[PDB]
Ligand binder design. Structure first.
Ligand SMILES: COc1ccc(C2=NN(C3CCCCCC3)C(=O)[C@@H]3CC=CC[C@H]23)cc1OCCCCOc1ccc(-c2nnn[nH]2)cc1
Ligand SMILES: [Mg+2]
Ligand SMILES: [Zn+2]
Length: 337
């Protein structure tokens, strides 16, 4: 049916399989995957990642249950949102899947930790409406009321994602022990909340101390003795994945840039209509896309990736090199005097 081969029904089994040959690579093209999955990249990639990692066997999750949860999860991403839709979530899950296999980390995490990070990635933007926390707070929106102006979206994402486990044949965690569930749940909450950019400076600071204190085994594998160190590395890992667009090949990055700006400008138009001040970045009449990308990189993406790369030295060199090449491409495109 192919639904068993890929988790989704598509006449393009062959093309889809070709794209998935790069499941374990940074250079996977999730846009193509969306094309050949009848626009269900999340269900598809998660299915592929779960097969590659043996996680349905390990946690005793029937494909029925898995595919039903993922399709529901995917339907709760909004297709009319330009950036924060299932494709982005798919990208992040797949990117996290790759980061987990970094040779300096590959031995380090339990399957339950691997499960949690990848599930977190999948859920981390579900039911995103295409506007920032701040817009939500300033418009006295229902979600901001529900969450007291604090990580309003990131809280909602977790809620929706855990809530969907209760639908008919959707409980993918049924056959974990109660203790496994509790641990997984804590780890997921921590990772998804860490995706709020208001924590970025705080994760980075912590990541930096992991680097200043890094111990390695005789084989070269990072040594992370306790839960706190482990969850610190994973929460940063999921954050890196979330901020990975500029480390991908230029072709992929430019599309991510188009989409994020499309989403910002949609927000800016809603701000204009309501007579509010237009948030920075969100005014189509005045943004420099190119300079913005370079700032993004100079102040947020590169520092974070430079520190990740120190942690896993040299296992992220190629990612760092690509980011630098992409930075200089965006630089060269800035209009001059
Ligand atoms: C493909 O391009 C993106 C991808 C993602 C984003 C995001 N952005 N952000 C925020 C948005 C507020 C303003 C900038 C901070 C990042 C989210 O919260 C989003 C939700 C979660 C994770 C990242 C997402 C933004 C992307 O580019 C848009 C351009 C970003 C510009 O950023 C700058 C950063 C600092 C400087 C600066 N200059 N001097 N000192 N500091 C100048 C510019
Ligand atoms: Mg988010
Ligand atoms: Zn995200």
């Amino acid at each position: 049916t192919s639904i068993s081969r890929f988790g989704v029904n598509t006449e393009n089994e062959d093309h889809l399989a070709k794209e998935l040959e790069d499941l374990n690579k940074w250079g996977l093209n999730i846009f193509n995957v969306a094309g050949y999955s009848h626009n269900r990249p999340l269900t598809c990639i998660m299915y592929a990642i779960f097969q590659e990692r043996d996680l349905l066997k390990t946690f005793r999750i029937s494909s029925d249950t898995f595919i039903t949860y993922m399709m529901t999860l995917e339907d709760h991403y909004h297709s009319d949102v330009a950036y924060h839709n299932s494709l982005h979530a798919a990208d992040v899950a797949q990117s996290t899947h790759v980061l987990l296999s970094t040779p300096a980390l590959d031995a380090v995490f339990t399957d339950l930790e691997i499960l949690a990070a990848i599930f977190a990635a999948a859920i981390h933007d579900v039911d995103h409406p295409g506007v920032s926390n701040q817009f939500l707070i300033n418009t006295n929106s229902e979600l901001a009321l529900m969450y007291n102006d604090e990580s309003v979206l990131e809280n909602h994402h977790l809620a929706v994602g855990f809530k969907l486990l209760q639908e008919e044949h959707c409980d993918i965690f049924m056959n974990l022990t109660k203790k496994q569930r509790q641990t997984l749940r804590k780890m997921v909450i921590d990772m998804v909340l860490a995706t709020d950019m208001s924590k970025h400076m705080s994760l980075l600071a912590d990541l930096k101390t992991m680097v200043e204190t890094k111990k390695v085994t005789s084989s070269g594998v990072l040594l992370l003795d306790n839960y706190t160190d482990r969850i610190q590395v994973l929460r940063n890992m999921v954050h890196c994945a979330d901020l990975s667009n500029p480390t991908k090949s230029l072709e992929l990055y430019r599309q991510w840039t188009d989409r994020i700006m499309e989403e910002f400008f949609q927000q800016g138009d809603k701000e204009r209509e309501r007579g509010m001040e237009i948030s920075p970045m969100c005014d189509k009449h005045t943004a420099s896309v190119e300079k913005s990308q370079v700032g993004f990189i100079d102040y947020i993406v590169h520092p974070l990736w430079e520190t990740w790369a120190d942690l896993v030295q040299p296992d992220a060199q190629d990612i760092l090199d690509t980011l630098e090449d992409n930075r200089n491409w965006y630089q060269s495109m800035i209009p001059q005097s």
